[PDB]
Amino acid sequence: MTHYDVVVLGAGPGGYVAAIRAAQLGLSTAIVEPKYWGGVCLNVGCIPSKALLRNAELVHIFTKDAKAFGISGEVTFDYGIAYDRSRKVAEGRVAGVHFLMKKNKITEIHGYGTFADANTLLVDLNDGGTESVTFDNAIIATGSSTRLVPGTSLSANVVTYEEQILSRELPKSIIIAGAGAIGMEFGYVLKNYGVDVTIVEFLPRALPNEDADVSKEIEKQFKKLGVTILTATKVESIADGGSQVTVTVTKDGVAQELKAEKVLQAIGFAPNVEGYGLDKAGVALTDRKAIGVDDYMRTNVGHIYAIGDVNGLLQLAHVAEAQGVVAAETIAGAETLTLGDHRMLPRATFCQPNVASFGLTEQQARNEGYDVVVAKFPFTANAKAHGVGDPSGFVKLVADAKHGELLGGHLVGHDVAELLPELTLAQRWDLTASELARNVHTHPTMSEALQECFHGLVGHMINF
Amino acid sequence: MTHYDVVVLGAGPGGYVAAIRAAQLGLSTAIVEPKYWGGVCLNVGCIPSKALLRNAELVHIFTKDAKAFGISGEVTFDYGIAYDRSRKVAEGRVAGVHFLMKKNKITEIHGYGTFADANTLLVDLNDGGTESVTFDNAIIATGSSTRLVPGTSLSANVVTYEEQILSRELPKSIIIAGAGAIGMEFGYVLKNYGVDVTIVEFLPRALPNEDADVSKEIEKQFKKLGVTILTATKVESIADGGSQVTVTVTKDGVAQELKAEKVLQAIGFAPNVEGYGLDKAGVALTDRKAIGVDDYMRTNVGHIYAIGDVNGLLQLAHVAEAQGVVAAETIAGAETLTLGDHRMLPRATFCQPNVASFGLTEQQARNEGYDVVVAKFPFTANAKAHGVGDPSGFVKLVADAKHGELLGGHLVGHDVAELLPELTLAQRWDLTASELARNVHTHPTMSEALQECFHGLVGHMINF
Ligand SMILES: Cc1cc2nc3c(=O)[nH]c(=O)nc-3n(C[C@H](O)[C@H](O)[C@H](O)COP(=O)(O)OP(=O)(O)OC[C@H]3O[C@@H](n4cnc5c(N)ncnc54)[C@H](O)[C@@H]3O)c2cc1C
Ligand SMILES: Cc1cc2nc3c(=O)[nH]c(=O)nc-3n(C[C@H](O)[C@H](O)[C@H](O)COP(=O)(O)OP(=O)(O)OC[C@H]3O[C@@H](n4cnc5c(N)ncnc54)[C@H](O)[C@@H]3O)c2cc1C
């Protein structure tokens, strides 16, 4: 039936952006989405959570630091309003997507898509109808879905980020499976609102993907916040009894029964790869059930690309958009530039203090065989940190002794997730610590912490 | 009979930092300071003021968005406590300075220095003594002082940043002369604490040194705050009546009276150049009554350098430090790098929303015959901005069409002062919009605004 130069499956951060880039390159484009315009990110992930995170932060300040700031008076916080605001922000962002589609003359198709042929797509319109769509190129951005603990299932008390982020009421207590960004974030929010929070992690450290120093620090903050985190603990089963939930866990042989009114499943996310004829299109998967892809987001099938979480490279919004652009451009044959080693891409957990990082960890760089060089500067020695009321955290940078090329960056502190830009730019365009050390940073700011690390990397730090 | 390889006048940011770099380079160093160790910045400038801006920010967040965040109850902010914190933060930084002086084996000389020769310094010790010190090199970092309005004088109710920032009690009202960073910052603090603030600016724009777009925006914010700003108005005279101060001003060829309990004078700062025998050393001044220097902070006298506000290039703390390094490095004969066109150096106003900028403004870049290219991006289209509860402001970039080289950056919004690093690094190391547009930014962050501008600079944006 209808035909288009390019058709994207999914309107998440990766899908709607790849669609825009395709449109900007003069390519007839259409996007197929049945539910979430803006994907999980805008509707029930990035956007809404960051809103709640901010609310939780203020509850923290006007509580634990009220006296330190000369604040008096009895004050209370209604999570309901927090919830409502988060939904409003999301709602506004979603509206933006539809605007962008209209502005770029991108055709929207409201329904579920299924590959019938290598260049045909059968769509189940949300109105009940059904239309066939031919395409010379296709971009799969179907995202991913939360992976539950083997043997367990979702119920009224055992939920995923989705059902939890849409709850206007909070439980008296909760048990979170997974100490990843998403798990830590909910822990921060919930705890700040009076919910007893226990976080269980199979690996030996919270935020295991991060550098060991970062994990150790963020664990200090959470324990200080009142959150109970259990590492090297394995979740055996989750039994929802109605009045409460019993999660059996094991650690070094000993097994105990943890009970809470609710349990959030967040151990990981597995790409959505089944149910829409990926096999009929010819697209192959990986040993990890992820869509195989090359440096150009291209799949085993030439005209079919896979971007976003569906390829499991780095399940993060900005990555999905980045791959989307690389997908569209390469399709149009226009100038593009592969992202390269996806480990060099930035990431951040938005609890307070923030956790931001990129590249390899100290240990990682070592095992890799590089001539590792490390510099670490505490925020207790930063003026801005003291002025804002959060002197915690630090900036740890990793480079190679040869010419001083950055290998990675690991930060923890007040909104440090904004300090990554300079680092990645330098690593991507080969700017050594020597050049970084000659860049003047405004005073007084958190960024100065980076400047000192640049100095400690090259020669000696000044204000330390 | 004491002699040193290098002698530093003034212990402000540039001073003590210069002394530090010198020591690190194995140079016998001594620093002369009679009053403020850490200079105006750590004692009554940067440091203390930033802390006060943080308290004011929290007062603004509550009084205006308390319900928007679901905060219920009535609280009170005690400025006296805010004041006490600012002093603690300050004394902490000062104490740190002495630490670095000892750590680097730098000799502290407590007293006022006066030149007698090009290699001899007479010192009026604070203990009443009077000794002399010789040197092979000298670094003049005597900072600046408040330039009063012609014909006016200081008094009990007519003060400068020093008396103001050091007062624990607040006035019922105040008139601030000068809409520069310092003036605007004080307005914000005082207003948020219940004071009736009126700011008078000779020029037709607040923050006239910034880009017109930024000035307009910041002017709108302050109006909503309740701050009265009179631009294109000249202060004719200030009469301290004891129980009331009268400020005669002229706007539209018509003189009129403005009255308040106090009046802050902050129209500008003049480099400290007299009273310490600069002529005895034979150091020349510019037509602006500032110590002349070359790209290496070198004065007309070969072994005499001047850094900081004293040279009036760019009166800021990071600038002073950066110049100190170049100075000390040049003396020691170590590899260095000139800062270059000081106009490209970053600056920021720490009121909320912040104001951050660097390089040329749009109009300046045009007047200088550049093939100007601009890219603006609003924060209302930024996910993080909504999450934080302040989508106001924007990011304006200006570049040259030749190769997409950056000429200037002008931002306004939530703590945007932390977003300059990437921009100045690129401008300093010939990275263009094209390389900048290929740098992925963590989502969702304020820095994503930069990323959009980069795109709209190389061609077309994405989320707008
Ligand atoms: C609570 C939470 C917080 C997060 N916080 C962050 C953060 O701070 N930063 C960050 O970078 N990432 C964050 N993430 C992750 C981020 O949301 C994902 O990385 C991102 O959404 C992936 O984008 P995507 O476009 O690949 O897919 P998704 O956004 O998952 O979108 C896929 C879309 O495709 C549609 N679809 C699927 N199959 C079909 C089909 N067959 N036909 C038609 N449509 C289909 C779906 O309905 C869906 O809307 C967070 C996630 C969660 C759950
Ligand atoms: C209220 C206020 C807020 C500010 N906020 C900021 C901000 O947020 N960010 C920013 O970057 N800048 C800010 N500034 C500006 C910043 O403080 C100055 O740019 C910086 O202090 C200049 O450093 P300096 O070393 O040149 O001189 P100063 O710090 O002024 O120090 C000069 C020192 O020299 C000493 N001295 C003078 N003559 C002699 C002599 N003959 N012998 C011995 N010692 C002598 C003095 O006693 C003094 O301590 C602010 C300034 C004020 C007033």
| Chain CA centroid to CA B49, Å | 11
DSSP E strands, A253-328: 254-260, 263-265, 268-271, 304-306
Report the alpha-carbon distance of residue B399 to residue B407 in Å, rounded: 5
Whether residue A132 is found in the same domain as residue A274: yes
Task: Choose which residue among A17, A33, A40, A278 to substitute to test ligand 1 binding: the one with the highest number of ligand atoms within 8 A of its C-beta.
Answer: A40
Identify whether the C-beta of residue B24 lies closer than 8 Å to the C-beta of residue B329: no
* Amino acid at position B165, single letter: I
User: Whole-angstrom Cα distance, residue A352 to residue B123?
Assistant: 50
Nearest to B171 by CA among B79, B60, B76: B79
Tell me, using a 6 A CB cutoff, whether residue A268 lines ligand 1: no
User: What does the alpha-carbon distance between residue B315 and residue B307 come to, in Å, rounded to a whole number?
Assistant: 10
**Whether A256 and A305 share a structural domain:** no
Among the listed residues B39, B53, B154, B144, the one whose alpha carbon sits nearest the alpha carbon of residue B94: B39
Please report, for the domain that includes residue B412, its CATH number.
3.30.390.30
CA atoms within 13 A on the CB side of B53: 26
Residues B367, B391: one domain?
yes
**Tokens 């609102």 -> residue:** A193
Active site residues of B: 443
CA dihedral A51, A52, A58, A61 (to 10 degrees): -130
Tokens found for residue A178: 């997974």
Which parts of A178-309 are beta strand (E)? 196-200, 228-230, 234-240, 245-251, 254-260, 263-265, 268-271, 304-306
Are residues A174 and A117 part of one domain? no
Amino acid (one-letter) located at A358: F
Report the length, in residues, of chain B. 464
- DSSP annotation of B105 reads T
B170/A423 Cα distance (integer angstroms): 43
For residues A196 and A316, membership in a common domain is answered with no
Exposure of A280 by Cβ count < 10 A (0-12 exposed, 13-18 middle, 19+ buried)?
middle
Give dist(CA A50, CA A75) in Å, integer.
23
Do B256 and B284 fall into the same domain? no
Q: Are A394 and A217 in contact (CB under 8 A)?
A: yes
CB atoms within 10 A of CB A66: 17
To the nearest whole angstrom, how far is the Cα of B164 from the nearest Cα of chain A?
18
A442 vs B55, B346, B387: nearest CB? B346
Q: Amino acid identity, residue A424? A: T
Give the number of whichever ligand sits closest to the CA of residue A138. 1
Experimentally, the structure was elucidated by X-ray
| Contact (Cβ atoms closer than 8 angstroms) between residue A206 and residue A215 | yes
- Which amino acid, B271? P
B436 interfacial to chain A (CB closer than 8 Å): yes
Closest CB from B89, B428, B460 relative to A387 = B89
Residue at a domain's end among A291, A308, A342: A342
Report the alpha-carbon distance of residue A383 to residue A390 in Å, rounded.
10
Whole-angstrom Cα distance, residue B97 to residue B12?
10
**Closest-lying ligand 1 atom to the alpha carbon of residue A307:** 26
Q: Are strands B131-140 and B120-125 parallel, antiparallel or unpaired?
A: antiparallel
Q: State which of A288, A311, A342 marks the end of a domain.
A: A342
Q: Around A104, how many Cα atoms within 13 Å sit in the side-chain half-sphere?
A: 30
Q: What is the CATH number of the domain that holds A156?
A: 3.50.50.60
Task: Find chain A residues with C-beta within 8 A of B411's C-beta.
Answer: none
Contact B353, B416 (CB under 8 A): yes
CB B320 within 8 A of CB B309: yes
A282 labelled binding-site residue:
no
Q: Which ligand is located closest to the Cα atom of residue A442?
A: 2
CB A173 within 8 Å of CB A191: no
- Residue B104, chain A, CB below 8 Å: the answer is no
Q: What element of type H or E holds B82? A: helix B79-103
d(CA B447, CA B418): 9
C-alpha–C-alpha distance, residues B305 and A351, integer Å: 47
- Test A383 with B46 for CB contact under 8 angstroms: yes
| B379-399 burial code (b ≥16 CB/10 A, e <16) | bebbbbbbbbbbbbbbbbbbb
The token pair at A463 is: 């204000």
H/E segment holding residue B167: none
How are beta strands B372-378 and B394-400 bridged, if at all?
Answer: antiparallel
Residues 6+ positions from B379 with CB-CB distance below 8 Å: B385, B390, B391, B392, B393, B394, B395, B413, B414, B446, B449
Q: Which two tokens stand for residue A101?
A: 């589609």
- Residue A183 annotated in ligand binding: no
Q: Give the number of the ligand closest to the Cα of residue B53.
A: 2
Q: Are residues B94 and B171 in the same domain?
A: no
B201 and B277 both lie in a single domain: no
Q: Does the beta carbon of B12 sit less than 6 angstroms from any atom of ligand 2?
A: yes
* Alpha-carbon gap, residue A24 to A33, rounded angstroms: 20
CB atoms within 10 A of CB A426: 26
Question: What is the rounded distance in angstroms from the CA atom of residue A74 to the CA atom of residue B399?
Answer: 51
- Alpha-carbon span A453 to A294, nearest angstrom: 35
Looking at the 3D structure of chain A, how many domains does it have?
3
End-to-end CA distance of chain A: 69
- Please check whether residues A136 and A6 belong to one and the same domain: yes
DSSP symbol at A384: H
> Closest Cα to residue A271, out of A324, A314, A302?
A314
Closest chain B residue to A443, measured at CA: B318
The rounded distance, in Å, linking the Cα atoms of B359 and B367 is 14
Are A433 and A454 in contact, with CB atoms under 8 Å apart?
yes
Most B CBs within 10 Å: which of A440, A454, A462, as the mutation test of the B interface? A440
Residue A291 to residues A38, A282, A307, A332, Cα–Cα distance (Å)? 21, 11, 9, 22
Resolution rounded to one decimal, in angstroms = 2.4
The C-alpha atoms of residue A271 and residue B296 are separated, in whole angstroms, by 57
Domain range for A152: 147-267
In a shared domain, residues A464 and A378: yes
Number of H helices, E strands in chain B: 14, 24
Residue A201 and residue A311 share a domain: no
| Strand B354-359, strand B405-413: pairing | antiparallel
Helices (H), A333-380: 362-368
Which tokens go with A66?
Answer: 């009220």
Cα angle at A33 between A30 and A37, to 5 degrees?
A: 105
Tell me the HSE value of A153 on the side-chain side, using a 13 A CA sphere: 2
Whole-angstrom Cα distance, residue A134 to residue A125?
A: 16
Domain boundary among B219, B249, B267: B267
Ligand 1 pocket member A346 (CB < 6 A)? no
Query: What residue's CA is closest to ligand 1, atom 7?
Result: A46
Chain-centroid distance of CA A449 in Å reads: 24
- Can you tell me whether residue A51 is helix, strand or coil? helix
Residues A116, A58 share a domain: yes
* A241-to-A157, A238, A261, A266, B372 alpha-carbon distances in Å: 9, 10, 9, 20, 67
Closest atom of ligand 2 to B186 CA is 1
B341, B314 Cβ separation under 8 angstroms: no
Distances in Å between the Cα of A218 and the Cα atoms of A391, A424, B377 are: 14, 23, 34
List binding-site positions of B for FAD: 33-41, 50, 113, 309, 317
> What distance in Å separates the CA atoms of residue A310 and residue A290, rounded to the nearest whole number?
6
Peptide bond into B346 cis (omega under 30): no
